[PDB]
Amino acid sequence: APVLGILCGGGPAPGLNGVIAGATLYALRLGWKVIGFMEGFKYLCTGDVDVVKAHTIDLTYDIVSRIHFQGGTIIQTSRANPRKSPELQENVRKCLRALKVRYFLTIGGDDTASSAVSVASGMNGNEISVISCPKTIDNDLPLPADQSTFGFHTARSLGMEIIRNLMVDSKSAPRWFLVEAMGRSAGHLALGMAEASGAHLCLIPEEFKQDEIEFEDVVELVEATILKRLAYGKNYGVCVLAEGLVSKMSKKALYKLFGNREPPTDLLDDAELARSLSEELLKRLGNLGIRITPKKIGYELRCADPVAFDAVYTRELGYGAIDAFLNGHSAALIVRENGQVKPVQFKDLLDPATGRVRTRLVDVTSQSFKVARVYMWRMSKKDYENKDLVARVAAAGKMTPEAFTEKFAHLTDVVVE
Amino acid sequence: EAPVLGILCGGGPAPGLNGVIAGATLYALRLGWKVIGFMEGFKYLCTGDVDVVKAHTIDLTYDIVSRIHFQGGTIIQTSRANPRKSPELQENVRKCLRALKVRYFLTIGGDDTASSAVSVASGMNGNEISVISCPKTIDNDLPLPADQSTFGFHTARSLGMEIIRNLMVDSKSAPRWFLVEAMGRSAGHLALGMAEASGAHLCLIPEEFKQDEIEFEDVVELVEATILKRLAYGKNYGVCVLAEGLVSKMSKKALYKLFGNREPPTDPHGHILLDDAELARSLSEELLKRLGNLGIRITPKKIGYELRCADPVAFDAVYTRELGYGAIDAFLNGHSAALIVRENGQVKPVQFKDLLDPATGRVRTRLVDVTSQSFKVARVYMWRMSKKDYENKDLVARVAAAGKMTPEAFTEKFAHLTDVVVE
Amino acid sequence: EAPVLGILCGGGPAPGLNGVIAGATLYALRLGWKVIGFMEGFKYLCTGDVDVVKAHTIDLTYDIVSRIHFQGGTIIQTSRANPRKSPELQENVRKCLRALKVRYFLTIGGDDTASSAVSVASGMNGNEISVISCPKTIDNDLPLPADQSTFGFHTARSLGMEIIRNLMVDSKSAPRWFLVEAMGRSAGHLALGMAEASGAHLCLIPEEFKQDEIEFEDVVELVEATILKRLAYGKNYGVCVLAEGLVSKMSKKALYKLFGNREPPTDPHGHILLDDAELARSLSEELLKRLGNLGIRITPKKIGYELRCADPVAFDAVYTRELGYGAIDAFLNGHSAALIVRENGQVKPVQFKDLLDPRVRTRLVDVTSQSFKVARVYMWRMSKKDYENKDLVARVAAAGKMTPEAFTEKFAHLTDVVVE
Amino acid sequence: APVLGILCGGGPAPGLNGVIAGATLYALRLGWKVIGFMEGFKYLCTGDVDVVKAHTIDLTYDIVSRIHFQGGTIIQTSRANPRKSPELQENVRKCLRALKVRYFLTIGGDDTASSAVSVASGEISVISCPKTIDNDLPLPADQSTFGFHTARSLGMEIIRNLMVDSKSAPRWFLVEAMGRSAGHLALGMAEASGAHLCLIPEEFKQDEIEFEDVVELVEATILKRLAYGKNYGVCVLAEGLVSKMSKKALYKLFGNREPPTDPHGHILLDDAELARSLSEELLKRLGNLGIRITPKKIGYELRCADPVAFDAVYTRELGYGAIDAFLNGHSAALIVRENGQVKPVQFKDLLDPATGRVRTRLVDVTSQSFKVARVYMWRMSKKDYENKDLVARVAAAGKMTPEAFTEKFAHLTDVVVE
Ligand SMILES: Nc1ncnc2c1ncn2[C@@H]1O[C@H](COP(=O)(O)O)[C@@H](O)[C@H]1O
Ligand SMILES: Nc1ncnc2c1ncn2[C@@H]1O[C@H](COP(=O)(O)O)[C@@H](O)[C@H]1O
Ligand SMILES: Nc1ncnc2c1ncn2[C@@H]1O[C@H](COP(=O)(O)O)[C@@H](O)[C@H]1O
Ligand SMILES: Nc1ncnc2c1ncn2[C@@H]1O[C@H](COP(=O)(O)O)[C@@H](O)[C@H]1O
Ligand SMILES: O=P(O)(O)OC[C@H]1O[C@H](O)[C@H](O)[C@@H]1O
Ligand SMILES: O=P(O)(O)OC[C@H]1O[C@H](O)[C@H](O)[C@@H]1O
Ligand SMILES: O=P(O)(O)OC[C@H]1O[C@H](O)[C@H](O)[C@@H]1O
Ligand SMILES: O=P(O)(O)OC[C@H]1O[C@H](O)[C@H](O)[C@@H]1O
Ligand SMILES: [Mg+2]
């Protein structure tokens, strides 16, 4: 009876347990023995056969038969990475061989799969075969457009519900919420939350023409939306911001981001973008009876119980991983393109630019992105050319139609219309 | 004056109806259109009385629709009253639409609603009114490119998943078997989706039965062998999800037995009233006679009326907003007698004649593809006796012993089930 | 060694069972006690074979229970097996408890579980073992001070409200009447709670019927009058919630009509089987004959088992944690054959004798309380004054397509059938 | 036809629509005409009766028959305080008389009720209802203000997700629960979700708190968890710890700077980030041990969640009791529920003599409920500090001697109640 070894690396995503139970349940039906390494590679890195034994468990039918309802991961996860030093990988090989592992499945992000292949490449193919199931809550893998990664549906739906309450609260007690969606990689999650909840505005790094952002431009994009809605008798709303704006700002923009101060280094995590915009917008707009409050959606999504779409999705990835093992595949990533859970070789998907896996961003030319824009509140190219509109909007700001055009009309060159 | 967009909903409600209404109305309002909404579908348009229709038409304004994307149901209600099979009724709808100066006419409903919409258009100048329909089914039975859902389906399946979740915890905490009947006889998409997501131990849908007709006995025994196999592993509990469509695939011998060894009730037109069937209840009643003495409890449970007006999940909120936008886009581009659908992430108008099945003159019905990879994966995790399973003497020994019968008795009673359903 | 604490669950599950288990276990481990849990209640303690019991007992360690307060149901499962009817079985239970050196025996369950625990205790020494039971009922029918809830009732009521909420939107979007049957015949706390919270138009609990036996005709007419009054205001839809206990209060003639003018079902021993009674289904078919010509659709809906194992809401999470703590404190203070309950914000042991009047005194809805009166105001119903309002009776009668004389003679007697 | 005028004051709480629907629907049956003032006292305080009439609506059956399902308020709310100045009450009296409203119903918390009393001194009866998610109105013991159950329940669900994440990917979450008046909400969320630590101002003995003590209280819990093999957890902090802090503590809290202040000299505690500051300090002290720490705010997403069944029933009965108090001629009272009965309680009985405004009900840290909640927390008790064996294990977890651990932490037993 061969041995299967599963582990999780990187941040958790809803439905992580779904993959573990999908692979384990099918493997047990074949008669395999399944084990799970706690906290990813953290203890395989030490190379101590008994420190590892104290941190691996039997993945039995009883353990996994009902985890498909539950978020997080029963075998935990960690960012521990054996790929960064020649000693660590050998410690991994020493423990896999000592554990008589035959099939090796990892569930994790771009940095987690690379560890799997590197440890595998220094091992005989007849003794160990490696498979990985890439995971990401930011929906940034290069699957065919409109196709989502597992966990993304759960994250977007819970985020919609959180913004729903902020939408009702912003109207009931007039204010503006600046909701910062966690995740600097792409803009899929911020735009999905905003469009589903009817958020009045969404800013993502992908909608900016210039290769760097200026702090003042982001202030004016939000300031224009607040002015236009105020011009229609509404002093409240919700604006959603992808954190990826941070990783695109310029050096000067980052300096203003931290309060006109030099930023720390080894550091965009310490950045507080929604909070910084709230302070600047309050100096400019507070006199108009406008309250602004930042709010961060984020960590609370990572271990939400999977929605039905991600339950089916992850189970089919678990079966697929075992199926790739049976069909002899190795060094491949389990993906579902066009409704087929097929093994895909990491070479065929690794974009040569960054070395890591190709990251699919939001297509702001697609119609889907255009539809989201129609239901937002923003001054378009045509809007600035409407004298009657510009008159009311500038009046709402207690500025003249002229000063308003000086300040804000340039924004049509910062963001794709 | 400004062009008038009239909106109605037909058929049974599904999550996201308001989302379609808000997408069409908000976009139209930005274009300066006047948006009105007829209450209860074609109900009053069929009368032909202009005043009555005015008494059941409301002005769809910004503040009314600005926040209904959060809410299930339809703020303009819905009806199934349809004028398609009445030349007089079709004219009556035309007279009321002309009276209200309706330039763009949008219907949100199922097959009957869309067919009625085009029939109203067959006798109207193509430059005075355009007709667009937005297909709606929680049953997911539209012939969209497979694996792509219809709006409302994701919401119904997710809520359906959470109900069965509580039934799975309850069935294990207090050992019991639940027969969950998923309302709707169109297809098995809802049953299989809820069962696969919730990890139910069995899902029976009409698509997997090879015979053109189904026998009540074969359904009893398919569930029975699943229960026995579970019993052979120390587990006297589980959940089985039956698609209601099994009833409409049964033979008349199965119907008489289903209705209590009696005569199926019928309306005053000669049609069997299948809504009065109690599939899940009848099968648990029979299954208790056979397996009850093995310390097995069985309980029916229906799901599906509570699903139809659940608040839409994010996938449906985005979906229906894009559909409502697409309806207005079709109006602008000049399309008419077209249905707004989303294929490959693109909302496009598709002519109604192009969706007809030439054999029936009816829009095609997409059922579960039981030869798909997805369905095979679902079956892998179900608890059932497969073909090669019946050939394992050790396994049939354990299962037969669980049922307090001999191995030869088990093969006699249950081995024919591999020829009843696709393996 | 260290004291052994055995825990089991008996009967129907309710939200928060895991809360009581976790509250008792976590505190017990803080005291150094060993904690064990019996799968499926007394089912295996009845067999007597100790090795079988060991195969169905688990060590309740810190990591087993530290996070089950989120989870509904019970990890140690439950069963209706009760050794209270066989000292052959009670001796078997005592035998396995002694083998496992159970110093403290905490059972969570209903009447059969509670009484079964004390009878086993009666045949043992008061120093070797001590027994405490935590009463459990999702029906809120324990005799606590008025308005104070049993654990799990909040969770069940809130989930039921959500289901009716979907039914209310559906009934209005696609005009229809839903007859929501709230399962449970013990009392009407669940039905009234769900209906009041959800804005349901009518609620019928057996507590409001003045007479001792209920007639099938009268129940039909109480729903009928509400539907007609709604029709008289342009509303041809609504939700009416029926407590399943209406079946248990019906007269012999009423039962005969309820099952379809056939002999009521019965078990092999001759006792009536009310579980086969589809109360909402029968009332829908009957009300369809009478009101179908008016354009009224009526569909039944059952809200039962999906409540039992819903995840506990915050009120019940705090509740059952305080209960579990109180059970350990009762063991420490030397209490035995006692029930752990909470009254006026304090968890405390309460001897069996305090609450018992055969099974425990069933607390029913107080239909004379101000709480029930307020619920009635927001219902749609023909009060005694409504029947005497000539103008109103004309509108309702016309909605039902009958003369005011016919309406008054048929429906006006209902003022003496249910509390005014 | 008598006129009922309804407004909402203060921050929203789930069930406001329940009160409005219960009061409006009953008043409709009595034949009353019902109206609603937008944004609460914002425009009744102005005295411009022309502006007031613009932002008023007629509360009809269609408007309110189904809002009992919905959180938020259909008539909005503001924090405007007519009790601030003598005519701030006068403008309200003038506008109310102009509209000829017989019955005036305010739906708000401690600040709103005091405003209602400031106007109830002159034809027009005034009744309030107990709105607050902070559970800090002086209702009978063990009896909650409406909206508190819903806010606690949704807060528990949010923390549950943070609990699964803190264990799946070992991390510590510092949850800051909104509300500076009392610790009810923070304690309810933490107890129900099984959070490892909770800190509320009610448990500190001295009336001024030091930043160092707050940091060390979390530090002791994190170290103790490490001693027992766990490098993760969740800690809930009532944000009212900032309002109990000393001037020196506030200086450290705002990054060793003078706290921001309003044009009147009072301190702007809204700009404070308690959880963020503690996280930064604790990461400096414990990151080497393998401890990751992350702050999270909860509370703006709680104010307008759809009410739970408890608040739906509660607000339906409170709204009924408001019309019943009006029907009985009562005035200058707040509707309360005790033993399942709604009754008016005069504002005079609820006023604290020193403040002059409605009395704030804090958590009773001497009660059994609080003691039990503490038993399930991970903390160092007075006895634990006297356990030489336990102290050695925690100190080793913190990479320090037992002597150093006792010097730094043992004094905490005099900082908070045991
Ligand atoms: N940026 C915007 N996004 C969405 N709706 C808008 C926007 N600006 C105006 N509207 C609405 O579009 C409709 C027509 O606007 P108008 O033609 O300016 O009266 C009204 O309901 C406006 O409130
Ligand atoms: N019908 C079934 N569906 C899913 N899993 C099953 C089924 N029958 C057995 N198993 C499980 O498959 C694994 C291997 O089965 P066996 O080798 O027969 O013990 C065990 O975990 C069984 O419980
Ligand atoms: N049975 C009832 N329950 C609750 N509200 C009612 C009932 N009957 C009438 N109403 C409402 O009471 C108000 C006064 O009605 P009326 O007495 O007809 O003027 C209106 O909002 C009616 O819809
Ligand atoms: N401060 C605390 N709060 C809650 N549980 C604790 C605390 N300290 C220890 N425990 C647990 O209580 C039990 C007693 O452990 P010990 O004191 O080592 O015998 C073990 O399960 C510990 O993990
Ligand atoms: O806040 P309201 O004016 O009511 O509604 C604002 C709308 O604009 C937002 O993008 C959403 O699509 C909403 O429907
Ligand atoms: O825990 P049990 O009820 O034994 O088994 C549950 C699993 O069996 C079912 O087919 C699903 O695949 C679940 O994952
Ligand atoms: O909207 P409708 O169905 O007409 O009325 C709903 C109300 O009537 C019900 O008794 C409850 O009191 C609800 O508030
Ligand atoms: O699973 P762990 O995080 O170790 O412990 C969680 C428990 O510890 C906390 O104080 C609560 O009482 C929880 O029940
Ligand atoms: Mg206050």
JSON list of C-alpha atoms and ligand atoms in Angstrom, two decimals, chain A residues 21 25 61-62 64-68 315, chain B residues 168 171-172 195-196 198-202 230 235 237-238 381-383, ligand 6:
[
{"chain": "A", "resi": 21, "resn": "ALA", "atom": "CA", "xyz": [-10.86, 15.54, 1.66]},
{"chain": "A", "resi": 25, "resn": "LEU", "atom": "CA", "xyz": [-11.30, 10.13, 0.34]},
{"chain": "A", "resi": 61, "resn": "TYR", "atom": "CA", "xyz": [-11.75, 8.54, 6.58]},
{"chain": "A", "resi": 62, "resn": "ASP", "atom": "CA", "xyz": [-13.12, 9.75, 9.92]},
{"chain": "A", "resi": 64, "resn": "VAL", "atom": "CA", "xyz": [-11.75, 14.10, 6.46]},
{"chain": "A", "resi": 65, "resn": "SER", "atom": "CA", "xyz": [-15.27, 12.79, 5.75]},
{"chain": "A", "resi": 66, "resn": "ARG", "atom": "CA", "xyz": [-16.92, 16.05, 6.87]},
{"chain": "A", "resi": 67, "resn": "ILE", "atom": "CA", "xyz": [-14.30, 18.81, 6.55]},
{"chain": "A", "resi": 68, "resn": "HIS", "atom": "CA", "xyz": [-15.79, 19.90, 3.21]},
{"chain": "A", "resi": 315, "resn": "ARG", "atom": "CA", "xyz": [-13.66, 18.20, -4.40]},
{"chain": "B", "resi": 168, "resn": "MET", "atom": "CA", "xyz": [-26.08, 15.92, 7.75]},
{"chain": "B", "resi": 171, "resn": "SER", "atom": "CA", "xyz": [-28.44, 12.64, 10.81]},
{"chain": "B", "resi": 172, "resn": "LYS", "atom": "CA", "xyz": [-25.09, 11.77, 12.40]},
{"chain": "B", "resi": 195, "resn": "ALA", "atom": "CA", "xyz": [-25.86, 16.79, -2.99]},
{"chain": "B", "resi": 196, "resn": "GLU", "atom": "CA", "xyz": [-22.32, 17.11, -4.33]},
{"chain": "B", "resi": 198, "resn": "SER", "atom": "CA", "xyz": [-23.07, 18.99, 0.87]},
{"chain": "B", "resi": 199, "resn": "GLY", "atom": "CA", "xyz": [-21.41, 15.58, 0.48]},
{"chain": "B", "resi": 200, "resn": "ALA", "atom": "CA", "xyz": [-24.68, 13.67, 0.55]},
{"chain": "B", "resi": 201, "resn": "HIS", "atom": "CA", "xyz": [-24.28, 9.90, 0.32]},
{"chain": "B", "resi": 202, "resn": "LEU", "atom": "CA", "xyz": [-26.48, 9.53, -2.77]},
{"chain": "B", "resi": 230, "resn": "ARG", "atom": "CA", "xyz": [-23.46, 2.11, 4.70]},
{"chain": "B", "resi": 235, "resn": "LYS", "atom": "CA", "xyz": [-22.90, 3.82, 9.82]},
{"chain": "B", "resi": 237, "resn": "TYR", "atom": "CA", "xyz": [-27.30, 7.18, 8.91]},
{"chain": "B", "resi": 238, "resn": "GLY", "atom": "CA", "xyz": [-26.90, 9.42, 5.89]},
{"chain": "B", "resi": 381, "resn": "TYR", "atom": "CA", "xyz": [-17.93, 10.01, -3.68]},
{"chain": "B", "resi": 382, "resn": "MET", "atom": "CA", "xyz": [-21.46, 8.60, -3.46]},
{"chain": "B", "resi": 383, "resn": "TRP", "atom": "CA", "xyz": [-22.12, 5.51, -1.35]},
{"chain": "E", "resi": 6, "resn": "LIG", "atom": "O1", "xyz": [-18.88, 11.02, 7.58]},
{"chain": "E", "resi": 6, "resn": "LIG", "atom": "P1", "xyz": [-19.72, 10.03, 6.79]},
{"chain": "E", "resi": 6, "resn": "LIG", "atom": "O2", "xyz": [-21.20, 10.31, 6.88]},
{"chain": "E", "resi": 6, "resn": "LIG", "atom": "O3", "xyz": [-19.37, 8.59, 7.11]},
{"chain": "E", "resi": 6, "resn": "LIG", "atom": "O4", "xyz": [-19.30, 10.24, 5.24]},
{"chain": "E", "resi": 6, "resn": "LIG", "atom": "C1", "xyz": [-19.45, 11.56, 4.65]},
{"chain": "E", "resi": 6, "resn": "LIG", "atom": "C2", "xyz": [-18.84, 11.55, 3.27]},
{"chain": "E", "resi": 6, "resn": "LIG", "atom": "O5", "xyz": [-19.50, 10.54, 2.47]},
{"chain": "E", "resi": 6, "resn": "LIG", "atom": "C3", "xyz": [-20.30, 11.17, 1.49]},
{"chain": "E", "resi": 6, "resn": "LIG", "atom": "O6", "xyz": [-20.48, 10.36, 0.39]},
{"chain": "E", "resi": 6, "resn": "LIG", "atom": "C4", "xyz": [-19.54, 12.45, 1.15]},
{"chain": "E", "resi": 6, "resn": "LIG", "atom": "O7", "xyz": [-18.55, 12.29, 0.15]},
{"chain": "E", "resi": 6, "resn": "LIG", "atom": "C5", "xyz": [-18.93, 12.87, 2.48]},
{"chain": "E", "resi": 6, "resn": "LIG", "atom": "O8", "xyz": [-17.65, 13.48, 2.32]}
]
